[PDB]
Structure 1
Amino acid sequence: RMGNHDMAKELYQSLLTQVASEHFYFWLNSLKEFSHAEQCLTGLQEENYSSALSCIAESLKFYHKGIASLTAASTPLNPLSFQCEFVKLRIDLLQAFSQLICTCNSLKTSPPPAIALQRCGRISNQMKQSMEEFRSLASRYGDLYQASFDADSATLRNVELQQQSCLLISHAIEALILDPESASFQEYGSTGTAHADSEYERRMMSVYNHVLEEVESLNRKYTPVSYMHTACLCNAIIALLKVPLSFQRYFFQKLQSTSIKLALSPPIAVQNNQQLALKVEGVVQHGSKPGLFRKIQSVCLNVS
């Protein structure tokens, strides 16, 4: 939770032997791999992009082992839906960062052709693909937030911070490479009232603010394929990864569970003229007290 992942890896590794069920064995092994994978990013260094690539690859290897193990930990009862999806979005985020650093290095590792934006066709197209990937990642963090109805406020804020990091990188890509002219936005947010609820969140807001002001200082200064754009994006990625991931309560501990049975009238024929009349009904299940975090008074049933 506090991001101290090396010693967490040390403890989780010690716990594999003394557990009894295979599901918990996979779960503890997966936690060991995630903790080791996050500690792989501790060895990053500012303004060292080769080391950044190496560390992100080493992190992703253990992350992939861990997500395989954690998917093995799933069971009909208590299926690790939030943990699976959270780790998968971390997977995709680290892969997107690896791809972005690779492309930023490809600015110099693949000079443009004899073509007389344009004249930097490959780097511009892969910047565009990175932009689409980071926006899709932000959207997936958003629907993960929306599927997390039972989560506590801190876990929702942590997921919200993940989404905001994805949006920050995508907006930096756009305002430095793709559409600098029409992105004339003033970052006039009342940052004084940024009541950070944790040290991790505090570092998140500080790095957001630094990346955003660095982007603002470079709105129209250079041609959009300069090495300074690459340096800005890579420094944004490295600074975002330097603050370690902080798992939260909903990852480890489920409270205020709820679900819908959703009974309805039941390969069903019907006369075309006699249009279907459907009855849909359901009960809201509850684990212990119903209204612990969030209170439910609506069911916006959508049907297509």
Structure 2
Amino acid sequence: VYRIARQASRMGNHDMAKELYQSLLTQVASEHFYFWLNSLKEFSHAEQCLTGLQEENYSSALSCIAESLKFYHKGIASLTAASTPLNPLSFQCEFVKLRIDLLQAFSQLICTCNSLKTSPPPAIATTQRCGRISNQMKQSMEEFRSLASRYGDLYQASFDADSATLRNVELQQQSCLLISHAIEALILDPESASFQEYGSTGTAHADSEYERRMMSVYNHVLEEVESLNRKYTPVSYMHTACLCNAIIALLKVP
């Protein structure tokens, strides 16, 4: 049942992972193995919460993101308790921590997209960036670029993983670059983009189904970015809707 549970966690069926992790949690005869299984249970719970999404619905996005963060934080507390001097679990804690940081970057981004509907156009003083939303999405640049750098640092510091784990880390880093480019092409200086994705967007190796769905999401978001390039006002609401749909598309693929 432990092998079945970890196979389900590998593929993406996190509900059966939840149930078998419950079964393991009642079981087992040591401290840190118990904490490890509790952490895996909490991760499966947050990932089922992430599977419970609906397209073009930002309310459910905020709700399910908050549930995913709280279950991941119970899980990362369990992982920190599970760490041992003999087996210093370092990949797991960093991967979970950067996953938490990615979902909070997504949460700040989605509520920042909500801020245009929750604040003025700027102020009575402003009448080429006007409003607090420009500073907020500049902070989004800082957070997402730092997060991509931290994904790169996790990639470089492992050296002991296989091709699939490294490629998954590359998928997460490419998601961070995707959101960063999508924002800095829509709102923050459209003028010097001038690219329209002059590289290949097809004929991939596709070594896993998760890779293929990640690449399809990446290509769709880049298509939306190319189409919505320099037609509309710099703030816009098609821009915020594009970010919202991008975040939903990233969080749909589990």
CA distance, structure 1, for counterparts of residue 224 and residue 19 of structure 2: 38
The counterpart of 2:106, out of the listed 84, 97, 118, is 97
CA distance, structure 1, for counterparts of residue 230 and residue 55 of structure 2: 25
Q: Does 1:6 align with 2:11?
A: no
Question: TM-score under structure 2 normalisation?
Answer: 0.93
Instruction: Give the deviation of 1:189 after TM superposition.
Output: 2.3
Change in Cα spacing, 1:119 to 1:164, as seen in structure 2 (3 Å) is closer
Determine if contact 1:67/1:88 at 8 Å carries over to the other structure: yes
Determine if contact 2:46/2:69 at 8 Å carries over to the other structure: yes
Instruction: Give the deviation of 1:119 after TM superposition.
Output: 5.3
Determine if contact 1:174/1:180 at 8 Å carries over to the other structure: yes
Instruction: Give the deviation of 1:43 after TM superposition.
Output: 1.1
The counterpart of 2:186, out of the listed 167, 176, 186, is 176
Determine if contact 1:52/1:238 at 8 Å carries over to the other structure: yes
Question: What SS is found at the alignment partner of 1:16?
Answer: helix
Determine if contact 1:33/1:63 at 8 Å carries over to the other structure: yes
Determine if contact 2:185/2:193 at 8 Å carries over to the other structure: yes
The counterpart of 2:81, out of the listed 72, 76, 80, is 72
CA distance, structure 1, for counterparts of residue 155 and residue 26 of structure 2: 35
Structure 2: tracts of 5 or more residues without a match: 1-9
Determine if contact 1:112/1:119 at 8 Å carries over to the other structure: no
Determine if contact 2:80/2:93 at 8 Å carries over to the other structure: yes
Instruction: Give the deviation of 1:157 after TM superposition.
Output: 0.2
CA distance, structure 1, for counterparts of residue 95 and residue 62 of structure 2: 22
Instruction: Give the deviation of 1:112 after TM superposition.
Output: 2.9
CA offset digits 1:257-287 (Å, max 9, x no partner): xxxxxxxxxxxxxxxxxxxxxxxxxxxxxxx
CA distance, structure 1, for counterparts of residue 60 and residue 116 of structure 2: 18
Question: What SS is found at the alignment partner of 2:87?
Answer: coil
Determine if contact 1:135/1:167 at 8 Å carries over to the other structure: yes
Instruction: Give the deviation of 1:75 after TM superposition.
Output: 0.3
Instruction: Give the deviation of 1:179 after TM superposition.
Output: 1.4
CA offset digits 1:185-236 (Å, max 9, x no partner): 1313223321111011100000000000100101101112111000000100
Q: Which residue of 2 aligns with 1:191?
A: 201
CA distance, structure 2, for counterparts of residue 188 and residue 175 of structure 1: 14
CA distance, structure 1, for counterparts of residue 123 and residue 84 of structure 2: 57
Structure 1: tracts of 5 or more residues without a match: 244-304
CA offset digits 1:122-158 (Å, max 9, x no partner): 0000010011100000000000000110000100000
Instruction: Give the deviation of 1:120 after TM superposition.
Output: 2.8
Determine if contact 1:103/1:123 at 8 Å carries over to the other structure: yes
Change in Cα spacing, 1:135 to 1:119, as seen in structure 2 (3 Å) is closer
Determine if contact 1:67/1:84 at 8 Å carries over to the other structure: yes
Equivalent residues, number: 242
- Identical pairs, percent: 100
CA distance, structure 2, for counterparts of residue 191 and residue 176 of structure 1: 20
CA distance, structure 1, for counterparts of residue 202 and residue 104 of structure 2: 34
Say which is worse superposed, 183-192 or 160-169, in terms of deviation: 183-192
Determine if contact 1:113/1:119 at 8 Å carries over to the other structure: no
Question: TM-score under structure 1 normalisation?
Answer: 0.78
CA distance, structure 2, for counterparts of residue 6 and residue 106 of structure 1: 34
Q: Which has the higher helix share?
A: 2
Instruction: Give the deviation of 1:115 after TM superposition.
Output: 4.5
Q: CA RMSD in A?
A: 1.1
Q: Which residue of 2 aligns with 1:53?
A: 62
Question: What SS is found at the alignment partner of 2:55?
Answer: coil
Instruction: Give the deviation of 1:78 after TM superposition.
Output: 1.5
Say which is worse superposed, 205-214 or 179-188, in terms of deviation: 179-188
Determine if contact 2:32/2:83 at 8 Å carries over to the other structure: yes
Q: Does 1:24 align with 2:43?
A: no
Question: What SS is found at the alignment partner of 2:117?
Answer: helix
Determine if contact 2:122/2:132 at 8 Å carries over to the other structure: no
